[PDB]
Amino acid sequence: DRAITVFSPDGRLFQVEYAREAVKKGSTALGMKFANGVLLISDKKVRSRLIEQNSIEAIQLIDDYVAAVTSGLVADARVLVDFARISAQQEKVTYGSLVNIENLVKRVADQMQQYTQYGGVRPYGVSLIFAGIDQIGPRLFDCDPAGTINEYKATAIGSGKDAVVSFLEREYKENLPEKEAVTLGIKALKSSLEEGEELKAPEIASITVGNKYRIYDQEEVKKFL
Amino acid sequence: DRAITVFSPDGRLFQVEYAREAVKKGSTALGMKFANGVLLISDKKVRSRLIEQNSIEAIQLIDDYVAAVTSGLVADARVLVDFARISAQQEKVTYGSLVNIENLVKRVADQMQQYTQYGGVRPYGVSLIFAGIDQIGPRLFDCDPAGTINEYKATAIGSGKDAVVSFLEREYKENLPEKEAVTLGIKALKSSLEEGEELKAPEIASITVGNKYRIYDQEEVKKFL
Amino acid sequence: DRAITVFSPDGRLFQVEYAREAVKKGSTALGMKFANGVLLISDKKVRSRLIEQNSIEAIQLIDDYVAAVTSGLVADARVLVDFARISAQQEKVTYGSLVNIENLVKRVADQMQQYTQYGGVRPYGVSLIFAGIDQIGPRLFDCDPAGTINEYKATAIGSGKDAVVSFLEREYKENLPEKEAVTLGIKALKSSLEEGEELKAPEIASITVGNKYRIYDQEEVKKFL
Amino acid sequence: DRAITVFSPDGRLFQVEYAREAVKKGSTALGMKFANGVLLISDKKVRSRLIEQNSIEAIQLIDDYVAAVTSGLVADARVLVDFARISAQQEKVTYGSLVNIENLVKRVADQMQQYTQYGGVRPYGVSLIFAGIDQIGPRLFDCDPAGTINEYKATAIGSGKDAVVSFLEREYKENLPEKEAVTLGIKALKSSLEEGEELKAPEIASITVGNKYRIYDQEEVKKFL
Amino acid sequence: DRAITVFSPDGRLFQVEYAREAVKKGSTALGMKFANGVLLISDKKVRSRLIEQNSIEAIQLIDDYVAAVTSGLVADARVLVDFARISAQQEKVTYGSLVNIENLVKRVADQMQQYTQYGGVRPYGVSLIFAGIDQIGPRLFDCDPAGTINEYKATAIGSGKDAVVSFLEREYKENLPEKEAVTLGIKALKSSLEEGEELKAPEIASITVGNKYRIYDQEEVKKFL
Amino acid sequence: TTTVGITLKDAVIMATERRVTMENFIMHKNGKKLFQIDTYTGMTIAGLVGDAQVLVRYMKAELELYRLQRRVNMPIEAVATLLSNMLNQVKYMPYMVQLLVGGIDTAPHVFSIDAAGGSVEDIYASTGSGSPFVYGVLESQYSEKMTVDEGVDLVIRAISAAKQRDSASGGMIDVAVITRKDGYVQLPTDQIESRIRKLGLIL
Amino acid sequence: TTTVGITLKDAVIMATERRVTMENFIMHKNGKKLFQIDTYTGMTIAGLVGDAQVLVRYMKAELELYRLQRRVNMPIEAVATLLSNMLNQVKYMPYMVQLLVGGIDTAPHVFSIDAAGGSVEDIYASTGSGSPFVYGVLESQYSEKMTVDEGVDLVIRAISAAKQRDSASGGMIDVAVITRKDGYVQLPTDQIESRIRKLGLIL
Amino acid sequence: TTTVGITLKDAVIMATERRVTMENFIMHKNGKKLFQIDTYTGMTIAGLVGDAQVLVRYMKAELELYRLQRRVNMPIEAVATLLSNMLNQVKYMPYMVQLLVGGIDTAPHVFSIDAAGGSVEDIYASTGSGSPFVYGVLESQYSEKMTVDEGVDLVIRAISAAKQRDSASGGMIDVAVITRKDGYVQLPTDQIESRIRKLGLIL
Amino acid sequence: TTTVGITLKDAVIMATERRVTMENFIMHKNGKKLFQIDTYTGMTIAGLVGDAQVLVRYMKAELELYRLQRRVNMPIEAVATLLSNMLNQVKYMPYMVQLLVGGIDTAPHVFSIDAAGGSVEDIYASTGSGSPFVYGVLESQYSEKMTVDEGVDLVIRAISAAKQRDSASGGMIDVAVITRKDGYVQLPTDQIESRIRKLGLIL
Known part of the structure; x- marks a missing residue:
């Protein structure tokens, strides 16, 4: 029961639970919609000084019009982000454009559901949130070690899941200019991660509908810090 | 749980841990960037006198512009280094040149992640560091029995992981000429491995950006020893 | 843990260990380089008188320019020696000549590493030493039930591993004429195997660089006995 | 350990042992060389009177120039003898003649070694001796549930292994005319099987070099009985 | 050990034993040769009155010149008899005629030996006797859940194995006219099955060499009853 | 299907025309033959339309994937x-295409690829049925010291001289200019008409 | 490639010649065309040499296997x-052969098999390029009441009459006689020369 | 597509030209036909451009892999x-190439390989369409006692005599000199022009 | 591509020539056509060069493997x-070769194998384009009682008579002599020139 994906005595998949507690041990990250787009801010806690600070990136691009920040086991994260990249390229070859970002999150969620389903393989112990604009508009998703997806206006992931989601539950405003949006996001990241009495400079990207992708540099994030 | 790669009661892959303690039992090796390149020094502790000293090499070449020194189980090390060699040759045939060394470490890390992932096979109990120049410049990587990679300016591996990384954490300088760089590396290798009250002549290679590969001989390393 | 190749609680492959204690139960054999070649002497303890003494041969030829003597389980020995023979013939058909004997020992060692690696099959419980000349010169190798290879000037294998290797560790001289070399080898074989208070006539072959293979007959070995 | 072919705590394959005790429970049979050929005598203990005495044959022919008598499980015996027959016919088609009988025993021994090696199959619980002339001359082999072969001048198999081999160890003469050879063989078969205080008429075949195969009839064996 | 076909601690295949005790629980049947042919009599104990008495047949034809009566599990019996039918038809297509009935019993016995041999399948819990004339003459065989065959002049199978074989062991005469042969067979079937103090009308077929197959009707067997 | 591409000092000028005809009968008087496959790279297809468009989609997707996962452009x-x-993996069941690749990484390059897979770098190249007329104009007026405006005038003059003698070419002229400072820039239709009017040509 | 095989009362006589030629040019003046495939069975091949020898090896091995595992000869x-x-499993990628099978089980038989797989039993048969000359001789002198010596004389007369008019046949004559009492017996060369000398022929 | 390669005492001189033409129409006046595949080994391709370049990449990668994992050069x-x-594994779906391999391991060698796989070592060899003119010049002036400068003069004279009578060859001349002391050295363009001027030739 | 091989009392003499030509144009004036595949066995290839060399490598490796694992030579x-x-497993996608195998096990043998797989033993054999001239010389001067020196003279005379009338054959003559006492011995060039000078021939 507790070693391979089969049913409980009462309706619980034990390995998929253990994957959820594996993604509760990760690094926190969040994202929210603003007036004409969506942002993604990862905490980046550069621990030692030998780590090449800006070369490690957890906000990774799937396309010029879908991005992803992840949390959980970092190896399964990298493999799953590469699968999402090649699936987006498949849709670009077949239909001509990435019309729906919901299709892109659903195919990745089916890939995670398969190893939730079969024996002889463990579930992907990783959780991701996707963000970008499509023909419909700004979308913000979530993913689960079972393959469950949900659409949000503001969500979190990681070790500071619950504290950030509590602050977002209290203080989020729906239509919001980009500057005040990234300020609210940083206050959310602060209130949770200020238990080690430090935050750091985090990493943060943004899109407004019509434009391409823009990841900030080291200097711009410290003005909002 | 403790016999095949499945999840813990709390978020731990037990076999991948046991592989990490297998690579903690190996021989120590390290490497660091200097002003216009990167070096790799392995400890070589030639135990008996019947071993053909210079023919056993742990600093092995993947290409004329990527090298690798390993630590852990030596058989899995040899098989993984040969996979890295043929993958570098695949990229040379397909695109024309080895443009990114990060691609080369990521493909090998995916190969290790697969046997971390599936049942019916144990993880690769081996850890490697890669070093060389590409179009971007000097790079220095690391690899983990889970497939985790990290980019460094100075790192270690083996039995003297923690003591060497402590000395590197204290005394490393970023831009440094080649002679003082190999001197700092040898002092690092000394401070850990001088617990058996001996070091030996180690093996050490270097590149400066623009040139090909140069492994030292027996006589040159003893001047810096 | 103790029944199929998976990791220990601390970094040990239990089946590959049990294969090493299977090859410690075998018959002893050794070999050493001399001034312009290398010899291989197996102990041959012809137990009964019904065994056809000279037809059972543990010094078996892989080619006219690589030979092998084995120790351990004799069936796995025969299968592995036949794999080495057909691999040498593959290299002769592909490239034109057997340029490196290290290639030949490395392919066989990869074959043993595979069944060390996968489940559903036990490791090869056999150890071999290879000897011969190539373009580089005289080489003398060893093989391990994990697939570990090492290059020696003088080595042993079998039940008298440690006692012979102690005598070789004390009394070996690097450049040595063929007659005194086979005398030193027989003294090594004696000092260990003279615990059953008998040695016998052993089997012994030799090459000097330039010439083909020469296995002694029954009469020549008793002069050096 | 005791249920499928894996290693012991000390170097023993338990299933191949249990196959050896399965072939110790069989019917005894033996064979020896004489001056210009080789004979094979099986004990045949026709238990009931309803068994069609001469139609049950344990001395079975592989070719006009190789024969085989078996001991152990009779079903695995029949399957393995049929494999030896079709392998001899393969060599006749490919090369033109059965040049070596040692090749024929080695291919069958490799077939038994495979099911000694892999899981999901039990070892062949059967032992055979092969006899016949080739270009080299008269040969007499043995086979083992591990695939071990040995060349003899006189050997046995079955329930009376050890008592017959003791008598052969004492009283065998190397060059011997056919009549005294079959007399010595029958005395060997007697001394063991005269513990149920009966022998019976046994079955016995012979070749002298140059001629084809000759199995005796019922009347000729009773003269030597 | 007691659940899948592997070896005992002493040389016993436990599943093939359990199949033999499965065929000891079946319905009794027997057969014997007479002066120029062979008969097969099955007991048929038509238990209820709703069973369509003559349509259930345990003496089933494989060909116009081989028949078979079975005992054991009735489903595996039907599948194995159908395999024997199509194998006889294969030999008729390939060579032109069914020259040996011993070939037909040996191929079916090899089919049973395979599932005796491999794991992931249970042995056939069924025993059969074959009877018919070929170019050699009248033959009568037996088959075993291991694949063991024996040739008889008179044999039995089923619940009344031992009592019938005791009566056949005492009172069988080799050359015998058909009428006295079927009388002796019915006395054999009586002496065993008259423990429920009834026999019934049994089913019985016969061949004399030269003619085709003749199964009796309901009226003819009661004259010999 | 006249195509042309020339190099200058730190500039690549690539120009085509637009007419799709596979008969003695004109199907479409307005087609696409000049594509953009990367930030600083273009490609002109000439040959069979279907195979050409499939190669265009396959190259655009793979260049974009490489750029995203390496953060540098492909040379x-x-x-x-x-x-x-x-092209050469399928040389026995081939593609009926003949295409040019031009771009800027550190120096301007123009490659000319045929249907079997042979790519040869040259200074200027031209594929199609009007390629001998284009090579006749460019043999007598091309100079390496020309400026960007004179190059734009030269390719318009060459294609307008090929349109008069080749029955399978005609229509408006696409012109794209690749520069390290400004990127891939495609010149507007009114500017091309102004060039044609100030030179003294028709249509 | 003249072959012949006739039947008598409890005897089969099969005879060939020996010349290998595939041109207007004689390669070898001494070949093998008459084989023994069982204890009481022979076979003559005529056609393509390689396919013939492969069929010979395949039949000899399978007949020997059947004899060993059944202890009776195959009919x-x-x-x-x-x-x-x-032969008929591969009838679209065929063998270029034409062969005869003769033997004794309870009565003498001769079968004639073509390249597609049709086997027809007949009293006497002949394959090759000299087969019309052999059928011309055997049409006018064959009788069922002949003895073994007269049959041996007849097949020598037939092949020696076919050697004079066919350019592709010649050389010495193999003769084999199959009998239930004596088995497969092949007649010696000096005895064949004595037959030829007492009849009055040459070579 | 004129290629040439001669041997001397401890030197190999290999020279080609540069013109790519597959019509009666010159595509490119500057191509690559002389490659370096190892430290002391070169290779000249002549035939079909795509198959040639694929063979070049396949040989360079495999030679480099062998050198890295054996630490000695391949003979x-x-x-x-x-x-x-x-080349001979695919002899029914072949490559349309014809190439030369030259190098130094202990003595200078030149091998000549055709499209089916037959490699024959010879002293001097020449492939292409100007190969009879090159074999005509080298038949009357080659000597084994020549020096390195006289060999460089001879191959320039041979290719410049083949350029006058063959319409499919022309352009500048690549010359590479392989020596054990100095390695693979390719001679500069101004030095080749100085050779041509001091001999008395044109272009 | 003239090859020859004759037998004597306990000796096999096999001789070829050396010229590689597949045109009306001579590629190489020095090739290899006589190989050694075992201790007491040689083989001459004649036909297509690539397929010939592949068959040579395949036979040498398999003979060496058999010798090593059986400790006796193959008959x-x-x-x-x-x-x-x-050769006959691939008879529909064939090899274009025609080869001879000669050796000594207990008596001297020479086998002649064609491209389909038919092997016929004969006393002397000759393959190639000069084979009718060689069969014309050997028809009138061969005797079984000849010695080893007279055989060496005879094969030199035969090949030197075939070199005068066949345009596709010429060059130096390889001669190899196989004996049970001395093994495979290939005669030196100065000894062959001494034979030619004492007979009275040229080149």
């Missing part, structure tokens, strides 16, 4: 080598 | 049916 | 045998 | 049967 010689391998 | 009609199936 | 006869096996 | 009839099976 032009690597683009030509990749496309050469893609 | 002649079963031999012809097996060889017919072996 | 020239092993290079020719490997390339012969690679 | 000559087994060598010819193995090579016949190897």
Whole structure:
């Protein structure tokens, strides 16, 4: 029961639970919609000084019009982000454009559901949130070690899941200019991660509908810090 | 749980841990960037006198512009280094040149992640560091029995992981000429491995950006020893 | 843990260990380089008188320019020696000549590493030493039930591993004429195997660089006995 | 350990042992060389009177120039003898003649070694001796549930292994005319099987070099009985 | 050990034993040769009155010149008899005629030996006797859940194995006219099955060499009853 | 299907025309033959329309994937080598295409690839049925010291001289200019008409 | 490639010649065309040499295997049916052969098999390029009441009459006689020369 | 597509030209036909451009892999045998190439490989359409006692005599000199022009 | 491509020539056509060069493997049967070769194998384009009582008479002599020139 994906005595998949507690041990990250787009801010806690600070990136691009920040086991994260990249390229070859970002999150969620389903393989112990604009508009998703997806206006992931989601539950405003949006996001990241009495400079990207992708540099994030 | 790669009661892959303690039992090796390149020094502790000293090499070449020194189980090390060699040759045939060394470490890390992932096979109990120049410049990587990679300016591996990384954490300088760089590396290798009250002549290679590969001989390393 | 190749609680492959204690139960054999070649002497303890003494041969030829003597389980020995023979013939058909004997020992060692690696099959419980000349010169190798290879000037294998290797560790001289070399080898074989208070006539072959293979007959070995 | 072919705590394959005790429970049979050929005598203990005495044959022919008598499980015996027959016919088609009988025993021994090696199959619980002339001359082999072969001048198999081999160890003469050879063989078969205080008429075949195969009839064996 | 076909601690295949005790629980049947042919009599104990008495047949034809009566599990019996039918038809297509009935019993016995041999399948819990004339003459065989065959002049199978074989062991005469042969067979079937103090009308077929197959009707067997 | 591409000092000028005809009968008087496959790279297809468009989609997707997962653009010689391998793996069931690749990485390059997979770098190149007329104009007026405006005038003059003698070419003229400072820039229709009017040509 | 085989009362006489030629140029003046495939069975091949020798090896091995594992010889009609199936499984990528099978099980038989797989039993048969000359001689002198010596004389007369008019046949004559009492017996060369000398022929 | 390669005492001189033409129409006046595949080994391709370049990449990668994992260079006869096996595995769906391999391991070698896989070592060799003119010049002026400068003059004279009578060859001349002391050295363009001027030739 | 091989009392003499030509144009004036595949066995290839060399490597490796794992040499009839099976498994996608196998096991043998797989033993044999001239010389001067020196003179006379009338043959003459006492011995060039000078021939 507790070693391979089969049913409980009462309706619980034990390995998929253990994957959820594996993604509760990760690094926190969040994202929210603003007036004409969506942002993604990862905490980046550069621990030692030998780590090449800006070369490690957890906000990774799937396309010029879908991005992803992840949390959980970092190896399964990298493999799953590469699968999402090649699936987006498949849709670009077949239909001509990435019309729906919901299709892109659903195919990745089916890939995670398969190893939730079969024996002889463990579930992907990783959780991701996707963000970008499509023909419909700004979308913000979530993913689960079972393959469950949900659409949000503001969500979190990681070790500071619950504290950030509590602050977002209290203080989020729906239509919001980009500057005040990234300020609210940083206050959310602060209130949770200020238990080690430090935050750091985090990493943060943004899109407004019509434009391409823009990841900030080291200097711009410290003005909002 | 403790016999095949499945999840813990709390978020731990037990076999991948046991592989990490297998690579903690190996021989120590390290490497660091200097002003216009990167070096790799392995400890070589030639135990008996019947071993053909210079023919056993742990600093092995993947290409004329990527090298690798390993630590852990030596058989899995040899098989993984040969996979890295043929993958570098695949990229040379397909695109024309080895443009990114990060691609080369990521493909090998995916190969290790697969046997971390599936049942019916144990993880690769081996850890490697890669070093060389590409179009971007000097790079220095690391690899983990889970497939985790990290980019460094100075790192270690083996039995003297923690003591060497402590000395590197204290005394490393970023831009440094080649002679003082190999001197700092040898002092690092000394401070850990001088617990058996001996070091030996180690093996050490270097590149400066623009040139090909140069492994030292027996006589040159003893001047810096 | 103790029944199929998976990791220990601390970094040990239990089946590959049990294969090493299977090859410690075998018959002893050794070999050493001399001034312009290398010899291989197996102990041959012809137990009964019904065994056809000279037809059972543990010094078996892989080619006219690589030979092998084995120790351990004799069936796995025969299968592995036949794999080495057909691999040498593959290299002769592909490239034109057997340029490196290290290639030949490395392919066989990869074959043993595979069944060390996968489940559903036990490791090869056999150890071999290879000897011969190539373009580089005289080489003398060893093989391990994990697939570990090492290059020696003088080595042993079998039940008298440690006692012979102690005598070789004390009394070996690097450049040595063929007659005194086979005398030193027989003294090594004696000092260990003279615990059953008998040695016998052993089997012994030799090459000097330039010439083909020469296995002694029954009469020549008793002069050096 | 005791249920499928894996290693012991000390170097023993338990299933191949249990196959050896399965072939110790069989019917005894033996064979020896004489001056210009080789004979094979099986004990045949026709238990009931309803068994069609001469139609049950344990001395079975592989070719006009190789024969085989078996001991152990009779079903695995029949399957393995049929494999030896079709392998001899393969060599006749490919090369033109059965040049070596040692090749024929080695291919069958490799077939038994495979099911000694892999899981999901039990070892062949059967032992055979092969006899016949080739270009080299008269040969007499043995086979083992591990695939071990040995060349003899006189050997046995079955329930009376050890008592017959003791008598052969004492009283065998190397060059011997056919009549005294079959007399010595029958005395060997007697001394063991005269513990149920009966022998019976046994079955016995012979070749002298140059001629084809000759199995005796019922009347000729009773003269030597 | 007691659940899948592997070896005992002493040389016993436990599943093939359990199949033999499965065929000891079946319905009794027997057969014997007479002066120029062979008969097969099955007991048929038509238990209820709703069973369509003559349509259930345990003496089933494989060909116009081989028949078979079975005992054991009735489903595996039907599948194995159908395999024997199509194998006889294969030999008729390939060579032109069914020259040996011993070939037909040996191929079916090899089919049973395979599932005796491999794991992931249970042995056939069924025993059969074959009877018919070929170019050699009248033959009568037996088959075993291991694949063991024996040739008889008179044999039995089923619940009344031992009592019938005791009566056949005492009172069988080799050359015998058909009428006295079927009388002796019915006395054999009586002496065993008259423990429920009834026999019934049994089913019985016969061949004399030269003619085709003749199964009796309901009226003819009661004259010999 | 006249195509042309020339190099200058730190500039690549690539120009085509627009007419789709596979008969003695004009199907469409307005087609696309000049594409953009990377930030600083273009490609002109000439030959069979279906195979051409499939190669265009395959190159655009793979260049975009490489750019995203390496954060640097692919070099032009690597683009030509990749496309050469893609064409030469199927050389017995071939593609009926004949295409040009031009771009800027550190120096301007123009590669010319045929239907079997042979890619040869040259200074200026031209594919199609009007290629001998284009090579006749460019043999007598091309100079390496020309400026960007004179190059734009030269390719318009060459294609307008090929349109008069080749029955399978005609229509408006696409012109794209690739520069390291400004990127891939495609010149507007009114500017091309102003060029044609100030030179003294028709249509 | 003249072959012949006739039957008598409890005897089969099969005779060939020996010349290998595939041009207007004689390669070898001494070949093998008459084989023994069982204890009481022979076979003459005529056609393509390689396919013929492969069929010979395949039949000899399978007949020997059947004899060893059944302890009786295979009947002649079963031999012809097996060889017919072996030739007809590959009838679209065929063998270029034309062969005869003769033997004794209870009565003498001669079968004639073509390249597609049709086997027809007949009293006497002849394959090759000299087969019309052999059928011309055997049409006018064959009798069922002949003895073994007269049959041996007749096949020598037939082949020696076919050697004079066919350019592709010549050389010495193999003769083999199959009898239930004596088995497969091949007649010696000096005895064949004595037959030729007492009849009055040359070479 | 004129290629040439001669041997001397401890030197190999290999020279080609540069013109790519597959019509009666000159596509490119500057191509590459002389490659370096190892430290002391070169190779000249002549035939179909795509198949030639694919063979070049396949040989360079495999020679580099062998050198890295064995720490010695591959012998020239092993290079020719490997390339012969690679060409002869696909002999029914062939490559349309014709190439030369030259190098130094202990003595200078030149191998000549055709499209089916037959490699024959000879002293001097020449492939292409100007190969009869090159064999006509080298038949009357080659000597084994020549020096390195006289060899460089001879191959320039031979190719410049083949350029006058063959319409498919022309352009500048690549010359590469392989020596054990100095390695693979390719001579500069101004030095080749100085050779041509001091001999008395044009272009 | 003239080859020849004759037998004597306990000796086999096999001789070829050396010229590689597949045009009306001579590529190489020095090739290899006589190989050694075992201790007491040689083989001459004649036909297509690539397929010939592949068959040579395949036979040498397999003979060496058999010798090592059986400790006896393979008989000559087994060598010819193995090579016949190897050629006849692919008879529809064939090899364009025509080769001879000669050796000594207990008596001297010479086998002649064609491209389909038919191997026929004969006393003397000759393959190639000069084979009718060689068969014309050997028809009138061969005797079984000749010695080893007279045989060496005879094969030199035969090949030197075939070199005068066949345009596709010429060059120096390889001669190899196989004996049970001395093994495979190939005669030196100065000894062959001494033979030619004492007979009275040229080149």
